[PDB]
Design a protein around this motif. Structure first.
Motif, mmCIF file in Angstrom:
data_model
loop_
_atom_site.group_PDB
_atom_site.id
_atom_site.type_symbol
_atom_site.label_atom_id
_atom_site.label_comp_id
_atom_site.label_asym_id
_atom_site.label_seq_id
_atom_site.Cartn_x
_atom_site.Cartn_y
_atom_site.Cartn_z
ATOM 1 N N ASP A 109 8.718 -46.726 -41.609
ATOM 2 C CA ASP A 109 8.598 -45.875 -42.799
ATOM 3 C C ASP A 109 7.363 -44.973 -42.681
ATOM 4 O OD1 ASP A 109 7.404 -48.408 -45.233
ATOM 5 O OD2 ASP A 109 6.709 -47.911 -43.223
ATOM 6 N N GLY A 110 7.547 -43.836 -42.013
ATOM 7 C CA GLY A 110 6.461 -42.900 -41.801
ATOM 8 C C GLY A 110 5.377 -43.432 -40.885
ATOM 9 N N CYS A 111 4.162 -43.569 -41.420
ATOM 10 C CA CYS A 111 3.032 -44.029 -40.620
ATOM 11 C C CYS A 111 3.144 -45.495 -40.224
ATOM 12 C CB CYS A 111 1.723 -43.808 -41.378
ATOM 13 S SG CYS A 111 1.302 -42.078 -41.667
ATOM 14 N N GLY A 112 3.848 -46.310 -41.006
ATOM 15 C CA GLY A 112 3.923 -47.728 -40.721
ATOM 16 C C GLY A 112 5.325 -48.243 -40.473
ATOM 17 N N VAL A 113 5.469 -49.567 -40.419
ATOM 18 C CA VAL A 113 6.752 -50.214 -40.188
ATOM 19 C C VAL A 113 6.920 -51.314 -41.231
ATOM 20 C CG1 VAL A 113 5.922 -51.961 -38.541
ATOM 21 C CG2 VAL A 113 8.300 -51.111 -38.370
ATOM 22 N N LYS A 114 8.177 -51.626 -41.540
ATOM 23 C CA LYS A 114 8.523 -52.619 -42.551
ATOM 24 C C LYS A 114 8.951 -53.907 -41.864
ATOM 25 C CE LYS A 114 10.404 -51.663 -46.390
ATOM 26 N NZ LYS A 114 9.069 -51.907 -46.999
ATOM 27 N N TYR A 115 8.237 -54.993 -42.144
ATOM 28 C CA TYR A 115 8.605 -56.298 -41.614
ATOM 29 C C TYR A 115 9.617 -56.951 -42.547
ATOM 30 C CZ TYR A 115 8.220 -61.213 -40.261
ATOM 31 O OH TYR A 115 8.492 -62.506 -39.879
ATOM 32 N N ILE A 116 10.722 -57.419 -41.985
ATOM 33 C CA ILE A 116 11.834 -57.962 -42.753
ATOM 34 C C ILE A 116 11.956 -59.449 -42.445
ATOM 35 C CG2 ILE A 116 14.280 -57.767 -43.301
ATOM 36 C CD1 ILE A 116 14.171 -54.910 -42.217
ATOM 37 N N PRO A 117 11.455 -60.311 -43.321
ATOM 38 C CA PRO A 117 11.650 -61.752 -43.148
ATOM 39 C C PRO A 117 13.057 -62.168 -43.560
ATOM 40 C CG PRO A 117 10.482 -61.347 -45.173
ATOM 41 C CD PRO A 117 10.622 -60.008 -44.497
ATOM 42 N N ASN A 118 13.435 -63.365 -43.126
ATOM 43 C CA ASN A 118 14.708 -63.965 -43.527
ATOM 44 C C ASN A 118 14.511 -64.860 -44.749
ATOM 45 O OD1 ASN A 118 15.952 -62.829 -41.069
ATOM 46 N ND2 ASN A 118 14.809 -64.450 -40.017
ATOM 47 N N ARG A 119 13.859 -64.297 -45.772
ATOM 48 C CA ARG A 119 13.573 -65.040 -46.990
ATOM 49 C C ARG A 119 13.969 -64.309 -48.265
ATOM 50 N NH1 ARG A 119 9.088 -64.363 -47.885
ATOM 51 N NH2 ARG A 119 7.901 -63.285 -46.247
ATOM 52 N N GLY A 120 14.405 -63.056 -48.187
ATOM 53 C CA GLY A 120 14.804 -62.318 -49.361
ATOM 54 C C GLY A 120 16.244 -62.595 -49.736
ATOM 55 N N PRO A 121 16.764 -61.857 -50.716
ATOM 56 C CA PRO A 121 18.174 -62.013 -51.084
ATOM 57 C C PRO A 121 19.091 -61.569 -49.955
ATOM 58 C CG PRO A 121 17.233 -60.096 -52.157
ATOM 59 C CD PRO A 121 16.086 -60.853 -51.553
ATOM 60 N N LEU A 122 20.256 -62.217 -49.877
ATOM 61 C CA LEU A 122 21.197 -61.922 -48.804
ATOM 62 C C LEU A 122 21.846 -60.553 -48.970
ATOM 63 C CD1 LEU A 122 22.673 -63.062 -46.259
ATOM 64 C CD2 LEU A 122 24.334 -64.077 -47.823
ATOM 65 N N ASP A 123 21.856 -60.004 -50.188
ATOM 66 C CA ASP A 123 22.335 -58.641 -50.381
ATOM 67 C C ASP A 123 21.433 -57.619 -49.702
ATOM 68 O OD1 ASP A 123 24.561 -59.430 -51.860
ATOM 69 O OD2 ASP A 123 23.452 -59.388 -53.755
ATOM 70 N N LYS A 124 20.141 -57.926 -49.553
ATOM 71 C CA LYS A 124 19.269 -57.081 -48.745
ATOM 72 C C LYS A 124 19.652 -57.141 -47.273
ATOM 73 C CE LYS A 124 16.334 -55.623 -50.781
ATOM 74 N NZ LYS A 124 14.949 -56.168 -50.788
ATOM 75 N N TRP A 125 20.085 -58.311 -46.794
ATOM 76 C CA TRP A 125 20.604 -58.409 -45.435
ATOM 77 C C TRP A 125 21.919 -57.654 -45.289
ATOM 78 C CZ3 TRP A 125 25.082 -60.289 -43.255
ATOM 79 C CH2 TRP A 125 25.076 -60.456 -41.865
ATOM 80 N N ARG A 126 22.730 -57.613 -46.348
ATOM 81 C CA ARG A 126 23.957 -56.829 -46.325
ATOM 82 C C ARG A 126 23.697 -55.333 -46.436
ATOM 83 N NH1 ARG A 126 26.691 -60.950 -50.689
ATOM 84 N NH2 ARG A 126 27.381 -62.561 -49.209
ATOM 85 N N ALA A 127 22.526 -54.932 -46.939
ATOM 86 C CA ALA A 127 22.166 -53.518 -46.933
ATOM 87 C C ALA A 127 21.987 -52.998 -45.513
ATOM 88 C CB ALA A 127 20.894 -53.293 -47.748
ATOM 89 N N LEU A 128 21.410 -53.809 -44.632
ATOM 90 C CA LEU A 128 21.331 -53.510 -43.215
ATOM 91 C C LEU A 128 22.494 -54.195 -42.501
ATOM 92 C CD1 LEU A 128 18.980 -51.715 -42.027
ATOM 93 C CD2 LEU A 128 18.355 -52.746 -44.239
ATOM 94 N N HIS A 129 22.468 -54.165 -41.164
ATOM 95 C CA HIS A 129 23.476 -54.809 -40.314
ATOM 96 C C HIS A 129 24.887 -54.311 -40.621
ATOM 97 C CE1 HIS A 129 20.605 -57.795 -38.651
ATOM 98 N NE2 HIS A 129 20.057 -57.710 -39.850
ATOM 99 N N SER A 130 25.015 -53.035 -40.967
ATOM 100 C CA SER A 130 26.309 -52.461 -41.314
ATOM 101 C C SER A 130 26.356 -50.975 -40.977
ATOM 102 C CB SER A 130 26.611 -52.675 -42.799
ATOM 103 O OG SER A 130 25.517 -52.272 -43.605
#
Lengths: 169, 204, 293, 159
Positions: free
Chosen positions: B183-204
RNA sequence: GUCUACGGCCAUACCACCCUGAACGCGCCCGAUCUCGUCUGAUCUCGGAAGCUAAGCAGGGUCGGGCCUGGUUAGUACUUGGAUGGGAGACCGCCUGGGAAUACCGGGUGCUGUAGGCUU
RNA sequence: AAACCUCCCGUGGAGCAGAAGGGCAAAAGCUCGCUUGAUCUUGAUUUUCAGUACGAAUACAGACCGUGAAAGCGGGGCCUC
RNA sequence: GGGGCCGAAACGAUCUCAACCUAUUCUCAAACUUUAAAUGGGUAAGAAGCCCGGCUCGCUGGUGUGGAGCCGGGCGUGGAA
């Protein structure tokens, strides 16, 4: 086939704001007195505003709340003035609506020279049987999540009860 | 019109930041803390050249500005006007004082002169990121910025990818397997601890 | 857009209140005043008169606080009144008097003062209090617990107070909250308080309904008609109910039959099932796009 | 020179801990305190009447007087030449049972059980407490495998 | 197994959404003459029991947040005592003992006292 | 944009006379009802301490009371002058 | 909401630019803190302690209840370095 998820009216709140104080305020109290059939209750100013000409602890407005079958008769009389017409913005996010008028004479109140024109301000509180949990004494609690009244559900309730012809916007 | 940096080089007193009590402080000389092509993604500047201090001293704001201009002046000339992104990682919050003469020390408490930046040993002063072919352009330009700073400083080229906290040799596969999102200057770390709908937002 | 109030930092700073406070049953401000004893008493129990008037019952209990939890030495419910001959009207002022009377007489039975401290038998409604008899075990004392109930004149919480006091419990009280205490003239009428205890305030209402329209009388007092309750017979019906409490206030336990031992509730799901669900959902979602593409 | 106030520097001393504000729990109030009980002091910031001075915070005393809703105790305060056995009056919320004595009382009961026992036997069982002894020489084994060699790490500049 | 009344510990208990509740219950609910208080029986108080799990409440779930407890961070940072140790200083190294907190990654999502019910 | 009314969120981020700190949510805050425990008298203790005073405060005890239905609370101001 | 642009105008469309919102990121606080040391400050490590039986009380008291004080008696195996 819902048992008691029917949308009734909890209260009808009526308020008149004459703007400053005094003889104009107390002559508008008789307008709301004969409209409802109960003694109205005044309201004090919160603080001092030189822009609007008010100062601290001033009798500005007078308000009254109507319950029971008297509230719907006033609501049915008020919608005659508004031609069974509301707007999309009148409904609130909590599934309630309201509207303001400009002349009290068309609500069956005879005109008086001393008691001049004083408009009203209506607000309708919809409710289900079971909404008294949030305001009773001992065992309080929030009123569900799917038991609340939404803005969309408040629109269709008006359209089936009074033949709503609400224009968009 | 000010005293030399020898008087305020060492961290002598407790930290004295600009706050409700410390008021009437003149504004710091440094205003912009990063420049260049700052509106850039993390996929095009994977160098992360750092300036690392070696002593426990104080760095003044006008000293940071002195090393900001000279490092930027050659860096534009070396690779281009928008071929880099530089930052300074010292924000001067400590406020130094003056006992101005015209009495002695009869009730002598200081008046603010300016801001100054406390630094520890091994804490990064200046960070530069660019492409891989400008490695020697960054190192010698940072050597030019060493002369504007008091004390001893050492030049280290980090193993981090850009201005992030991740290692540069393994930055790629998390992007491909989708554990990191830039995301611009930085990067977003994605843990496997959020809602699964966030995982469904990616991987598609 | 506007700022969200309940963020991560909100729940981090959030301190939850007490469980009974969050539920809304215990008024912890008044609890400290009620149940705490003086330190120079050294474990002298402070018995308290708990009255909790619910929708279809009235609960009267006696408690004293131990550190593991307050001890209910004796209790009395309004649904026990049908055994004494009160078929209907279990949540009224009259039933409140009986369950207050039942608890006081039951409590005296355990400690052995059924004969001593008889109390009021000819009950009138005036001021009464239990004097300790010299050369005899002392009169029992306790303090009334309204809880969150609004203590106005004529409340059912004070109806059980009059029943317990007449039962032989030395509770400090006044006549200000009893029904009959006129607010403006500032005197207490004992005759008005007698009407509520024997239930003539209900009798007047049911006599009023039968006269003005019959169908509203059927709607209001439905089980009164079913149990054959008329205004004429209620007064001595309560006196018999008041009498029948006196000789046998002891409570018998219901026999416990063997438990079927089956789980009506839904049990808690394990960790392995938790891990399998998310993997299964991911597999279903992954094959969904493959079929789509 | 600082001021001579009663509550100087009690910004963090007489302050409730994090997420522990609000209504005081009722178990502290209704605890029982006899004469001679070992009691330590921890001032609570919610209640203000009967608040002990900050010099007794963290100290322990002994009960000599029990009133209706306060307990008088004798503490040991040292002031620049000697320890004073002084008498203070303090409310209940600043009063907790000290468990330093409780380890000794449970030892006395266990010792007296083992004093009546083996009295008909006569065996001198070790009754006193002993410090940590030497570690009682023992055989240590490794299951076939050799103890793996450890190595100092080469220096790399992490920063 | 579970509920009611009074609680103890006071988030493993809270918050947001979804699903399920047999029986007793708890409540929703129907009214205002009497006790009671309001502008209005909405609240409170009283008199009730035609309907209902719709809500409250109980239980379960969220690769949930939060919270609790662990690993990592890390024997790092820091620190008692010592040296005729270094270094111009700034500061750092060694002996001696003690020993943290983030980020990040795991596990869990109320026990329990008395009295009184239901599953007879 | 701020006059008045209603709904929802709202651990308090407002308010508690003042400077600041601590503490408080069916309160210690806002609004009503009643009252003058801001009354009389011994002693004890804490705070600066020399462990002496003054001032301030803390438990009590003996009385007369206020309030509340009661438990209790109150012999001035939520505590630090 | 300021500059414009197609618009009589329209939350209709339209590139934005601004403050606001949401996940991130750099750097801090003697008069900031969720956490949180090392060094320290009180205790207790028995005979002035336990375990018993009984009397007194004008205080508290469902209950020869609770508490305190008096007596008589038994435990030496001197209760960490």
């Amino acid at each position: 086939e819902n048992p008691m998820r029917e949308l009734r009216i909890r209260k009808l709140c009526l308020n008149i704001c004459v703007g400053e104080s005094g003889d104009r305020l107390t002559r508008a109290a008789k307008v709301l007195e004969q409209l409802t059939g109960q003694t109205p209750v005044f309201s004090k100013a919160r603080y001092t505003v030189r822009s609007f000409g008010i100062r601290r602890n001033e009798k500005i407005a007078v308000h009254c709340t109507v319950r029971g079958a008297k509230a719907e008769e006033i609501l049915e009389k008020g919608l005659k003035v508004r031609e069974y017409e509301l707007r999309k913005n009148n409904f609130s996010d909590t599934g309630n609506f309201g509207f303001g008028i400009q002349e009290h004479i068309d609500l069956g109140i005879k005109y008086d020279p001393s008691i001049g024109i004083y408009g009203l301000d209506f607000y309708v509180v919809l409710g289900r049987p079971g909404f008294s949990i949030a305001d009773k004494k001992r065992r309080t609690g929030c009123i569900g999540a799917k038991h609340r009244i939404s803005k969309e559900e408040a629109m269709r309730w008006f359209q089936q009860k009074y033949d709503g012809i609400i224009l968009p916007g | 019109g000010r005293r030399p940096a020898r008087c305020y080089r060492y961290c002598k007193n407790k930290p004295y930041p600009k706050s409700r009590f410390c008021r009437g402080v003149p504004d710091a000389k440094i205003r912009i803390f990063d420049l260049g092509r700052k509106k850039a993604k993390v996929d095009e500047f994977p160098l992360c050249g750092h300036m690392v201090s070696d002593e426990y001293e104080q760095l003044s704001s006008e000293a940071l500005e002195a090393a900001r201009i000279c490092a930027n002046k050659y860096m534009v000339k070396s690779c281009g006007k928008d071929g880099f992104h530089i930052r300074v990682r010292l924000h001067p919050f400590h406020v130094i004082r003056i006992n101005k003469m015209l009495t002695g020390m009869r009730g002598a408490f200081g008046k603010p002169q300016g801001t100054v930046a406390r630094v520890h040993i091994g804490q990064v002063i200046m960070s530069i990121r660019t492409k891989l072919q400008n490695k020697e352009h960054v190192v010698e330009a940072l050597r030019r910025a060493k002369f504007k700073f008091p004390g001893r400083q050492k030049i280290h080229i980090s193993k981090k990818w850009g201005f992030t906290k991740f290692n540069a040799d393994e930055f790629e596969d998390m992007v491909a397997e989708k554990r990191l999102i830039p995301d611009g200057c930085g990067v977003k770390y994605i843990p496997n601890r959020g809602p699964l709908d966030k995982w469904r937002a990616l991987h598609s | 857009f506007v700022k969200v109030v309940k963020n991560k930092a909100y729940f981090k700073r959030y301190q939850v209140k007490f469980r009974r406070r969050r539920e809304g049953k215990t008024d912890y401000y008044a609890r400290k005043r009620l149940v705490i004893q003086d330190k120079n008493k050294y474990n002298t129990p402070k018995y308290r008169m708990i009255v909790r008037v619910t929708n279809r019952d009235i609960i009267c209990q006696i408690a004293y606080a131990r550190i593991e939890g307050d001890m209910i030495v004796c209790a009395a419910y309004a649904h026990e009144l049908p055994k004494y001959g009160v078929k209907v009207g279990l949540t009224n002022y009259a039933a409140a008097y009986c369950t207050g009377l039942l608890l006081a007489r039951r409590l005296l039975n355990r400690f052995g003062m059924d004969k001593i401290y008889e109390g009021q038998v000819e009950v009138t409604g005036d001021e009464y209090n239990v004097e300790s008899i010299d050369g005899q075990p002392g009169a029992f004392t306790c303090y009334l617990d309204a809880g969150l109930a609004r203590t106005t004149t004529g409340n059912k919480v004070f109806g059980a107070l009059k029943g317990a006091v007449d039962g032989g419990l030395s509770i400090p009280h006044s006549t200000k909250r009893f029904p009959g205490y006129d607010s403006e003239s500032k005197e207490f009428n004992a005759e008005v308080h007698r009407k509520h205890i024997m239930g003539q305030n209900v009798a007047d209402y049911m006599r009023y309904l039968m006269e003005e329209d019959e169908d509203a009388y059927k709607k209001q007092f439905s089980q009164y008609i079913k149990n054959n309750v008329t205004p004429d017979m209620m007064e001595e019906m309560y006196k018999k109910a008041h009498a029948a409490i006196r000789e046998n206030p002891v409570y018998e336990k219901k026999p416990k039959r063997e438990v079927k031992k089956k789980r009506w509730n839904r049990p808690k799901m394990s960790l392995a099932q938790k891990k399998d669900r998310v993997a299964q959902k991911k597999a279903s979602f992954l094959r969904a796009q493959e079929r789509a593409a | 020179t600082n001021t001579k106030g009663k509550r100087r520097g009690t910004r963090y001393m007489f302050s409730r801990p994090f997420r522990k504000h609000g209504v005081v729990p009722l178990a502290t109030y209704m605890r029982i305190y006899k004469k001679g009980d070992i009691v330590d002091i921890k001032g609570m910031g919610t209640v203000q009447k009967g608040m002990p001075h900050k010099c007794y915070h963290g100290k322990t005393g002994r009960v000599y007087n029990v009133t209706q809703h306060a307990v008088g105790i004798v503490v040991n305060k040292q002031v620049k030449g000697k320890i004073l056995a002084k008498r203070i009056n303090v409310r209940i919320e600043h009063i907790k049972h000290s468990k330093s004595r409780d380890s000794f009382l449970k030892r006395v009961k266990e010792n007296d059980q083992k004093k009546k026992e083996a009295k008909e036997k006569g065996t001198w069982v070790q009754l006193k407490r002993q410090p940590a002894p030497p570690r009682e020489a023992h055989f240590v084994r490794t299951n076939g495998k050799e103890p793996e060699l450890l190595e100092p790490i080469p220096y790399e500049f992490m920063a």
